[PDB]
Amino acid sequence: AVKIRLKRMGAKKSPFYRIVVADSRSPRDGRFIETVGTYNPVAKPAEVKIDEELALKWLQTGAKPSDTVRNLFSSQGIMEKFHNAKQ
Amino acid sequence: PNIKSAIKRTKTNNERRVHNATIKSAMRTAIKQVEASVANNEADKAKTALTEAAKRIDKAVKTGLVHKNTAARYKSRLAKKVNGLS
Amino acid sequence: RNQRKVYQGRVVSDKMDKTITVVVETYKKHTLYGKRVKYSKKFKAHDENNQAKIGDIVKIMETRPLSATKRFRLVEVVEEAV
Amino acid sequence: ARYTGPSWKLSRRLGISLSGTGKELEKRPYAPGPHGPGQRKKLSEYGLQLQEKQKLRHMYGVNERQFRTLFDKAGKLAGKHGENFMILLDSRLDNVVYKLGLARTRRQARQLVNHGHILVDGSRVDIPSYLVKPGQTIGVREKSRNLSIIKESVEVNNFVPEYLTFDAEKLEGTFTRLPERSELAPEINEALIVEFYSR
Amino acid sequence: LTNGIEVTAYIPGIGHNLQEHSVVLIRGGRVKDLPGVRYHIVRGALDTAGVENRAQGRSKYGTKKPK
RNA sequence: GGAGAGUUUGAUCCUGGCUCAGGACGAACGCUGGCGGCGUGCCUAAUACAUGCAAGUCGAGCGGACAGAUGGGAGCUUGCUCCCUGAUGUUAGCGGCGGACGGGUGAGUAACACGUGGGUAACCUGCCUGUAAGACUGGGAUAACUCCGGGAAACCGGGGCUAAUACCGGAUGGUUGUUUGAACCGCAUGGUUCAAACAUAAAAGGUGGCUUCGGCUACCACUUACAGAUGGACCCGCGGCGCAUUAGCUAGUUGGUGAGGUAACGGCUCACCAAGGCGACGAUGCGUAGCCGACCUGAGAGGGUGAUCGGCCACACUGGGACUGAGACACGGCCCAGACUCCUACGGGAGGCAGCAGUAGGGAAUCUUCCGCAAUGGACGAAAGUCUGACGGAGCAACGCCGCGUGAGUGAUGAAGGUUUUCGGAUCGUAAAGCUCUGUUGUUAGGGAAGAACAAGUACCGUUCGAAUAGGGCGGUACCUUGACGGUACCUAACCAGAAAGCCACGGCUAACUACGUGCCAGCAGCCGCGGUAAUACGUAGGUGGCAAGCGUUGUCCGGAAUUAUUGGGCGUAAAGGGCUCGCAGGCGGUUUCUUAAGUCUGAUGUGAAAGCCCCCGGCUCAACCGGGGAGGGUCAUUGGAAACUGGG
């Protein structure tokens, strides 16, 4: 299935993450479908960039975000727009 | 096999093979009957055999043993040869 | 409706039933020296009625494989051989 | 690594004062070792280019790899290659603290910086090669405002260049603008340096 | 050599301890004036001892630093 | 955006090679060696592998065992004891999903394998979203568990019993098949929509709540159709190695008819017909090689490389085969054959590190039989959670890049001592010593992150189901829980200049000279060349120079090399005109006009993944490094235009 998940970038001890749309089977740091944003958990506060338009497009196609990405989308208010669109 | 799951998969694999063979054999048997009834020109038996051939073919598809396209091809082939009788 | 590759070319063989060997010719630049060289590509085409004879300038369109080597169909015979 | 050997002989070998004051060329203004006094030999073009390179390098106390890498960086900047190169060398933190007069010599300065006695915009920076940028304020940490050695330098020091500004009361300097090379050591013929590396 | 090739190798330095069956390490480098001598034996590698009493350019002759 | 130098001679100019100054590395070797950050580390034997781990999960699909025990009887020693089936718990087995991903290697492969641009009206797609319609009625088995035989066991056969969301009939179905009508539209086969008849083909329950106990309902699961998304399959244009001391190759080969087979076109296979197909625009054969993004080099054109990271392909002890499945002809699956290895009681069994560590061997040469699932990502589950040698960390190696140390100031009396000396002196030399100063680092204390987002669980809000004021789903909102790294980073304080500099070179190219020993010996050497009793070239010593926790040597690639010259060279005498003609193919071709639009130029559109190189910003104390935004890139494709030149008429 198509997932919205975190790709780990950066270096030892300084993790940086891209939110990419990817087939579940693909390796974590390998083939992906489309980049949707970035996530820097080490910074204070965690910097989060998301492209709403793209995020919603995939959510509506049925790509499920991973647990952490789901948390990100909630705090950014992406899940609200998704629920409301379906109603 | 080394992994416990692999051992069960080997047993399961052979059991499913046996069952499928019965189902696939019956389906082929039915096709043969229809082809026999066309060589000797017997519409009624051929026409009733064709229903039985259709039965067997579609039964294999329900389970998944034969692909939809493969079944369609068989049925088309058999149905046209039966029209040749009349 | 996407279009297939078209090739205007010249028939070179017609000895096979329903099959013509078209050839397409063009000037391609040489990779290192830049001189334009004659490049010729042969194509097997399908023509059911055997219209095109050896020498005709025929237009062919790409198709699904029709045999081991045939991948095109004769569309028209633009100019018949004299 | 960092040259911890005798200082004067470098000045003597190069025929310029590396401290800028003069005192290394008073008694023996000639190369070190027993062949210095007698010999008055002339240098080839390669010798002159190399000698000029060593003039700038030893003045600022930088190793060759770091020195050469910095030269390439100046390369990309707009304007005169040699001029830009010398601006970067002056921007080194150990140099800037020395020019502001917190240390009598560059070696002393570098040890102040290396040991962590300097602040740059309130934050500790213990790296001599730090490339001070225009606007930043160089200060001494509170723990080291009252170091004997730095007090000495602040009194004796005269003439802080025009591109810098200093406040002996607060012990905090500012890098207000770029040198522009008119202010910088004229002994150096930067033209030779650019040539030296084109080899 | 381990690849079956037979080569002539020059032994640099003053004096050596090589005999037949000594296992040695060779490196590239011809000896200009020795026809057919195209390799050097590395002093101080495998059986070849360093050079005795060598004090300058020791690294080139496999001589450890004396005290 | 492009530098040259030495060397043929008595001297010179040319030609011509050789050598050197630069950059790079998965490097190795010698000497030496303080630390930190970030990367990298079997390049050879795709050689053989001891040992441990690397794929499980679900009790909310199913039965049976085993515990657990609220209470009843219980027999008596107040010491315990059963015998149900409490709840509850555990799972050997059946069943579902997973195991086709993740991970490894580069042996094979010169090929639609790969790159690029298209095409499929010749295709398939579990899980994931959306839409719509359902989930009716019956039945027979079988593992587990028991008993028999073989076997030391492992394990291997037979008789009997029992369940399912396992399996199988029948009912109703929009798919599918046959036949028949229409409507419209393509690129030949044709495509899309509607309609009719006939024939086939579905499904499953589980958990919780509420019930008048019939059942209703939410969620998960199940069946069918249609879309979407994702993934895969096939075809085609073009591109990318050497050899002609490899010239003919092919016989299902090349087409056709028919049948079979495939998810699907197709000699894909077969039978029957015809003799065709490929090739000097390099077929065939031999050799060599995974391909690419990219990386190194260069002014560029080019040349080299294809390690780390990403994409695709191929492979899994060797060879073949098929089964299960949405997906394999399957690394840790099965069958057969071969090579090899292991256990044994000699009855019979068992295995495949090119998974992570590790061992042996080969080699000049490359690591720990480590910690943790805390983070990220997978598989299973309703969830808790289980699994995960993917991954996140730590360990070893100066292997590489970056950063910082090994002290700072003053200091002549220019001390002692070493070296040299024309014996005056010079030189190591402000260098020591002395006085003062610092604590990066080290040592010792104290404090100490971030990386953590969560989830479940309840409690509220909105909304959606529902009979519900029940209970769920979806979104929002409190509260709680969790760190391998690691008491690491980082911070603070105190003590101590104390522990922390080596390597190569100094005749010219090339920055850096003297003394002594040696006497064509010992030796040196990248090139010219040194050395045969005054060696700045050998060895040592002093000093100096170039670098610096590195420094040299060797090996490999590019440059310099215009030395394969497209950019950008030559052939009278330096190497180089065929002994000469005729001539097939090929290459090239006079002038005017018209036409065409293959080459050519041009507009628009599409495409050239991420990382990387370049530009601009920002975060690590700086730098390396990390991150964001752009730029750039093709003899590319679709579709218009121009007509001077080339090509066709």
Swiss-Prot record, chain A:
Subunit structure: Part of the 30S ribosomal subunit.
Domain of life: Bacteria
Pfam family name, one: Ribosomal_S16
Protein's name in the database: Small ribosomal subunit protein bS16
Cellular component GO terms held in the UniProt record: cytoplasm; small ribosomal subunit
Name of the gene: rpsP
Taxonomic source organism: Bacillus subtilis (strain 168)
Matches recorded under InterPro entries: Ribosomal_bS16, Ribosomal_bS16_CS, Ribosomal_bS16_dom_sf
Record bears the keyword rRNA-binding: no
Keyword DNA damage in annotation: no
Cross-referenced PANTHER family: 30S RIBOSOMAL PROTEIN S16, SMALL RIBOSOMAL SUBUNIT PROTEIN BS16M
Curated annotation (Swiss-Prot), chain B:
Disulfide bonds: none
Top-level taxonomic group: Bacteria
Pfam families: Ribosomal_S20p (PF01649)
Transmembrane segments: none
GO biological process per UniProt: translation
SUPFAM superfamilies from the UniProt entry: Ribosomal protein S20
Gene Ontology MF annotations: small ribosomal subunit rRNA binding; structural constituent of ribosome
Gene Ontology CC terms: cytosol; small ribosomal subunit
InterPro entries: Ribosomal_bS20 (IPR002583), Ribosomal_bS20_sf (IPR036510)
Keyword annotations: Ribonucleoprotein, Ribosomal protein, RNA-binding, rRNA-binding
Subunit structure: Part of the 30S ribosomal subunit.
Role description: Binds directly to 16S ribosomal RNA.
PANTHER family: 30S RIBOSOMAL PROTEIN S20, SMALL RIBOSOMAL SUBUNIT PROTEIN BS20C
Family as reported in the entry's similarity comment: Belongs to the bacterial ribosomal protein bS20 family.
Name of the protein described by the UniProt record: Small ribosomal subunit protein bS20
Species of provenance: Bacillus subtilis (strain 168)
Curated annotation (Swiss-Prot), chain C:
BP GO terms, sorted: translation
Regions annotated as coiled coil: none
Cell membrane listed as a keyword: no
UniProt keyword RNA-binding, yes or no: yes
GO cellular component terms given for this protein: cytosolic small ribosomal subunit
UniProt KW keywords: Ribonucleoprotein, Ribosomal protein, RNA-binding, rRNA-binding
GO MF, one example: rRNA binding
InterPro entries: NA-bd_OB-fold, Ribosomal_uS17, Ribosomal_uS17_bact/chlr, Ribosomal_uS17_CS
PROSITE patterns referenced in this protein's UniProt entry, alphabetically: RIBOSOMAL_S17 (PS00056)
Family matches, as CDD domains: Ribosomal_uS17
Gene3D superfamilies named in the record: Nucleic acid-binding proteins (2.40.50.140)
Pfam family, one: Ribosomal_S17
UniProt-listed NCBIfam families: PRK05610.1 (NF004123), uS17_bact (TIGR03635)
Family: Belongs to the universal ribosomal protein uS17 family.
Summary of subunit composition and partner proteins: Part of the 30S ribosomal subunit.
Primary role: One of the primary rRNA binding proteins, it binds specifically to the 5'-end of 16S ribosomal RNA.
PANTHER family for the chain: 40S RIBOSOMAL PROTEIN S11 FAMILY MEMBER, SMALL RIBOSOMAL SUBUNIT PROTEIN US17M
Protein name in the entry: Small ribosomal subunit protein uS17
Curated annotation (Swiss-Prot), chain D:
RNA-binding listed as a keyword: yes
A family per Pfam: S4
BP term (GO), one: translation
Domain of life: Bacteria
Residue intervals of the S4 RNA-binding domain: 91-154
Chain segments carrying region Disordered: 21-41
Residue pairs linked by disulfide bridges in the UniProt entry: none
Keywords: Repressor, Ribonucleoprotein, Ribosomal protein, RNA-binding, rRNA-binding
InterPro entries, sorted: Ribosomal_uS4 (IPR022801), Ribosomal_uS4_bac-type (IPR005709), Ribosomal_uS4_CS (IPR018079), Ribosomal_uS4_N (IPR001912), S4_RNA-bd (IPR002942), S4_RNA-bd_sf (IPR036986)
One of the record's GO cellular component terms: small ribosomal subunit
One of the record's GO molecular function terms: structural constituent of ribosome
Keyword Disulfide bond annotated: no
Protein family (similarity comment): Belongs to the universal ribosomal protein uS4 family.
Assembly information from the UniProt record: Part of the 30S ribosomal subunit. Contacts protein S5. The interaction surface between S4 and S5 is involved in control of translational fidelity.
Function as written in the Swiss-Prot or TrEMBL entry: One of the primary rRNA binding proteins, it binds directly to 16S rRNA where it nucleates assembly of the body of the 30S subunit. With S5 and S12 plays an important role in translational accuracy; many suppressors of streptomycin-dependent mutants of protein S12 are found in this protein, some but not all of which decrease translational accuracy (ram, ribosomal ambiguity mutations).
Record protein name field: Small ribosomal subunit protein uS4
Protein source organism: Bacillus subtilis (strain 168)
Gene symbol of the encoding locus: rpsD
